[PDB]
Amino acid sequence: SNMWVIGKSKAQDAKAIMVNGPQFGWYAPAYTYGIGLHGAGYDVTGNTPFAYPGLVFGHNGVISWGSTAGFGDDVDIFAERLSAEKPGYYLHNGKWVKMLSREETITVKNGQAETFTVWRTVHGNILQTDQTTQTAYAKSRAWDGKEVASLLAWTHQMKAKNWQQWTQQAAKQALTINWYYADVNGNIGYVHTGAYPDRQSGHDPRLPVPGTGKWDWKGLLPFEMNPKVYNPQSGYIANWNNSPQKDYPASDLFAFLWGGADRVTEIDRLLEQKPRLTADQAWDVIRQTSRQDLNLRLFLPTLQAATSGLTQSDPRRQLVETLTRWDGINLLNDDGKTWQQPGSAILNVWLTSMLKRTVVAAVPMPFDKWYSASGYETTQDGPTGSLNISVGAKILYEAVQGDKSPIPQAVDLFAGKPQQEVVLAALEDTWETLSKRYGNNVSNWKTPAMALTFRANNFFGVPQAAAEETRHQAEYQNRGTENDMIVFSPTTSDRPVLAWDVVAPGQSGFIAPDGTVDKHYEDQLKMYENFGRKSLWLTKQDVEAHKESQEVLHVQR
Amino acid sequence: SSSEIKIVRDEYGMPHIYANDTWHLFYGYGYVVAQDRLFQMEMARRSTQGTVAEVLGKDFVKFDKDIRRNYWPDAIRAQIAALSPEDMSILQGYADGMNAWIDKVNTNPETLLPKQFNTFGFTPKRWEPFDVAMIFVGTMANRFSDSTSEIDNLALLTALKDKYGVSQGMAVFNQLKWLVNPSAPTTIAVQESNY
Numbered sequence: 001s002n003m004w005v006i007g008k009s010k011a012q013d014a015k016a017i018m019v020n021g022p023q024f025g026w027y028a029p030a031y032t033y034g035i036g037l038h039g040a041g042y043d044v045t046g047n048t049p050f051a052y053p054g055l056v057f058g059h060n061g062v063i064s065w066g067s068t069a070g071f072g073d074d075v076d077i078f079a080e081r082l083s084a085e086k087p088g089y090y091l092h093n094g095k096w097v098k099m100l101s102r103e104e105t106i107t108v109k110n111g112q113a114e115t116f117t118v119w120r121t122v123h124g125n126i127l128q129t130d131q132t133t134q135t136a137y138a139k140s141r142a143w144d145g146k147e148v149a150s151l152l153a154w155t156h157q158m159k160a161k162n163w164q165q166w167t168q169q170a171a172k173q174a175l176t177i178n179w180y181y182a183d184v185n186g187n188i189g190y191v192h193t194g195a196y197p198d199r200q201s202g203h204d205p206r207l208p209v210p211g212t213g214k215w216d217w218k219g220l221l222p223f224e225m226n227p228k229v230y231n232p233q234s235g236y237i238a239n240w241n242n243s244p245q246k247d248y249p250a251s252d253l254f255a256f257l258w259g260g261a262d263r264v265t266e267i268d269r270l271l272e273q274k275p276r277l278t279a280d281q282a283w284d285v286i287r288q289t290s291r292q293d294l295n296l297r298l299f300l301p302t303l304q305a306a307t308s309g310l311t312q313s314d315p316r317r318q319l320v321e322t323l324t325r326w327d328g329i330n331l332l333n334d335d336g337k338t339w340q341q342p343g344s345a346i347l348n349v350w351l352t353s354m355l356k357r358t359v360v361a362a363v364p365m366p367f368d369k370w371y372s373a374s375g376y377e378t379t380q381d382g383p384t385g386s387l388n389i390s391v392g393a394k395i396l397y398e399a400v401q402g403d404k405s406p407i408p409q410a411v412d413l414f415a416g417k418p419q420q421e422v423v424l425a426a427l428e429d430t431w432e433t434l435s436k437r438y439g440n441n442v443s444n445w446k447t448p449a450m451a452l453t454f455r456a457n458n459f460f461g462v463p464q465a466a467a468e469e470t471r472h473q474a475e476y477q478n479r480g481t482e483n484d485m486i487v488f489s490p491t492t493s494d495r496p497v498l499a500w501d502v503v504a505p506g507q508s509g510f511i512a513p514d515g516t517v518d519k520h521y522e523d524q525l526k527m528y529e530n531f532g533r534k535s536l537w538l539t540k541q542d543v544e545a546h547k548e549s550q551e552v553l554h555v556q557r
Numbered sequence: 558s559s560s561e562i563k564i565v566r567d568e569y570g571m572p573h574i575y576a577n578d579t580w581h582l583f584y585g586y587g588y589v590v591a592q593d594r595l596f597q598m599e600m601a602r603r604s605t606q607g608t609v610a611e612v613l614g615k616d617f618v619k620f621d622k623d624i625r626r627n628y629w630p631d632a633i634r635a636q637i638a639a640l641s642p643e644d645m646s647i648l649q650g651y652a653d654g655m656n657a658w659i660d661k662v663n664t665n666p667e668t669l670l671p672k673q674f675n676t677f678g679f680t681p682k683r684w685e686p687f688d689v690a691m692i693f694v695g696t697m698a699n700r701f702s703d704s705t706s707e708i709d710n711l712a713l714l715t716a717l718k719d720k721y722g723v724s725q726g727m728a729v730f731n732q733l734k735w736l737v738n739p740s741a742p743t744t745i746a747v748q749e750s751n752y
C-alpha cells in the first residue's frame with residue numbers, strides 16, 4: 001500500500017494534499033464500501049474495507065486520514081514446556097499451570113460434523129506442539145485483548161479536529177498500522193501506531209523464546225516510543241510499507257526485509273523532482289508508480305559495469321543496451337496483451353539466474369526455495385497483490401554493494417568469483433532462454449504483459465460472488481485497490497476541502513433474484529482502468545445537489 | 558425527530574446517513590450495508606468465524622478449523638461486555654440496522670433476496686454485535702497484524718548451524734534475515750528522530 005501526503009511548503013494551489021492507495025488485492029464486489037455519516041458528533045465522507053463502523057479512508061471537513069500496513073514485530077512465539085504425565089499443563093514460574101481449552105464442532109453441508117479442541121496458555125493460543133520434545137508453541141500478540149478498542153479508535157478518530165485530538169485516538173489503535181494526518185491549515189503528520197512488547201534483555205525477536213517465565217515480556221512500550229513526525233522538514237510523508245524510521249526493527253517474517261533496495265524510493269524520486277505539486281500532479285504519481293519496473297534502478301549500474309568491455313556484437317551487451325535506453329515504465333502495445341519493451345522479461349530471467357548462482361547456492365535445502373523468486377511471478381489472472389522487490393533480490397543488492405553495505409557478508413555469495421563473471425554468466429543464460437523463444441532480433445520481441453483480475457473469491461479463498469462475476473482488466477497496475485485524494489484549501493474553489501475516490505467495480509454488489517443487476521454494480525470499473533475518479537461529497541448542499549434518491553425511516557430503539 | 562433516519566444516495570449510489578443519535582446513525586449505516594452488500598457480508602462473516610463448510614461443504618473443513626484455532630471467542634465477548642453504553646450503541650445500532658433489512662429480505666424473497674443466496678442454497682441470518690466486531694478482527698487484525706515466522710526462522714538457523722558450524726551459522730542468519738539495516742529508506746528523515 002502506498003501513501004504520499006504533501007504539506008504547505010510542497011503543495012501548489014492548496015495547503016495540503018493526501019493521496020492513498022491501500023493494496024489489499026482486487027475483488028468483486030469491491031473490497032471497500034463508500035459511506036457518509038452525518039449526525040451524533042460525526043460529519044464524515046469516504047470509503048472503508050468491509051464497511052467497518054470506522055472509515056479507514058476519508059475526511060471530516062477539517063482533517064483527513066489514511067493508513068498503510070505497519071509491519072513492526074508485535075507477535076512472538078513462546079515455547080511452552082509440557083509434561084508427558086500431567087497433560088494439559090505447562091510449566092510457568094515454577095508451578096504446573098493448566099491450559100484454557102474449548103471444544104469446537106464444524107458442521108459440514110453433505111458431510112459428517114468434526115470436533116476438535118483449541119488450547120490456550122497465558123501466552124496465547126497453541127499453534128503447534130512437539131510431542132518428541134514435549135514443547136508447545138503459543139503465539140503471543142501484543143494487541144491481544146485490545147481488538148475491540150482498536151476498532152473504536154478507528155471510529156472515534158473521525159471526530160478529531162486537530163493533531164492533539166487525533167493522536168489521542170492513534171494511541172489506542174493497537175494493531176501495527178501506519179496512520180497519516182492532514183488538515184485545513186496545511187499541517188501533515190504520521191504515526192506508526194500499535195502496541196509493541198517491552199522485551200527482556202537478550203531476547204532476539206526473530207526466534208522463539210522459552211515460555212517458562214524468565215523471557216515473558218515486561219509489558220508494552222509507551223506510545224512515546226512509537227515512531228511519529230509532524231510537519232516534517234521535507235514537506236512530505238511517503239510510505240510504501242518501508243521502514244518508519246532509522247533503526248526500527250521489522251516483522252520477523254523471513255520473507256520480509258527493510259534494506260537498501262526499497263520500492264518507496266520510486267515515490268521519493270517523483271516527489272523530490274518538483275519543487276511544488278498540484279492536485280493533478282499528486283494524482284499523476286499513481287499512474288507513474290503503477291507502471292514502474294522496481295528492479296531496473298537497482299541492478300542497472302551492475303549490468304552496465306559488467307558489459308562495458310564487451311563488443312557491440314556481444315548479445316549480453318545488446319541486452320544491457322536495451323535496458324539502458326528504457327525508462328522502466330511498462331506500456332501495453334495495441335494488442336492489449338504485450339508490453340512495448342522487453343525490459344521486465346530480461347530482468348526477470350537474469351535475476352532468476354543470479355539468485356540461483358548466489359543466494360540459493362549458499363542456503364541449504366529446502367530453505368533455498370525461499371530465496372529464488374525474482375518477484376515477477378504471476379499467473380494468467382495476474383498478481384494477487386502489489387509488485388515488490390523479492391527478498392532474494394534485496395539480499396543480492398546488499399552483496400553487489402560490496403563494503404558500501406552495512407551488512408557484514410559472512411558468506412561471499414559470489415563464492416570467490418569476481419562479480420562481473422557471475423553477472424555475465426547470468427546474462428548468457430538470459431540470452432539463451434529469451435532468444436530461443438523470440439529469436440535474435442531484440443527489436444521485435446513482444447513479451448507478455450501482466451493482467452488484472454477482480455476476483456469473486458475473497459482473500460481467504462471463499463466465494464463472495466458467483467464465478468461469472470469475476471472481472472478482468474487488460475493492464476496490471478501496481479496501485480491501491482481503491483485510490484482516494486483529499487485536497488485542503490484549494491485556491492481554485494470556494495470549498496475548504498475537495499475529495500475524490502474510485503470504488504470499483506461499483507458501490508453495489510446487488511443482483512435481484514431474476515438476475516437484474518443493480519444500477520451501481522459496475523459503473524466505476526472503466527473509471528478505475530483509465531485512472532479516473534469521482535467526487536466525494538460532505539456538505540448538505542452538495543449531497544442534495546447530487547442526490548439520486550432518498551429514503552426516510554422512523555424507528556425507536 | 559429523534560426517531561428519524563434519512564438516507565440520501567448520490568449519483569454513484571453512495572449512501573449518506575442523517576440521524577440524531579449514535580444508535581440511529583449506525584442503524585442507518587448497517588441498513589444500507591445490508592441493501593448493497595448482503596451476500597459479501599454474509600460470506601465475510603462465515604469466513605471470519607470459520608462457518609464456511611456448513612454452507613459450502615467438505616473442501617472448507619480445514620479452513621474452518623484453521624480460523625477457529627486462531628482466536629478466542631470468549632475474549633472478544635468479554636471486551637464487548639465492558640463497553641460503555643455509547644460505545645455499545647455503535648455496534649448494536651449497526652447490527653440492528655442490518656437485521657431490519659434482513660427482516661424485509663426474508664419476508665419478500667421473490668424480489669429482495671440477492672441472487673447468490675439462491676445459487677448457493679442458503680439464506681441470510683441475523684447479526685449481533687459480536688459479528689460486527691469479528692468482521693474487523695478477522696480481516697484487519699488477522700490479515701495485517703498477525704505475521705510471524707519464528708518457528709520457520711529457527712529451522713533455517715539450525716540448518717545454517719549444521720552447514721557452517723555454530724558461530725558461522727548465526728552470522729549467515731544475520732546476513733539473510735538481519736534485525737536492522739541502517740541503509741533502509743525510511744518514512745521519517747534521520748534529522749527528525751531515530752528509534
Ligand SMILES: O=C(O)Cc1ccc(O)cc1
Nearest residue numbers: 001022023067068069701
Ligand atoms: O498495506 C497493506 O498491506 C494493506 C493495509 C492498508 C491499510 C491499512 O490500514 C491496513 C492494511
Ligand SMILES: [Ca+2]
Nearest residue numbers: 075076205252
Ligand atoms: Ca517476533
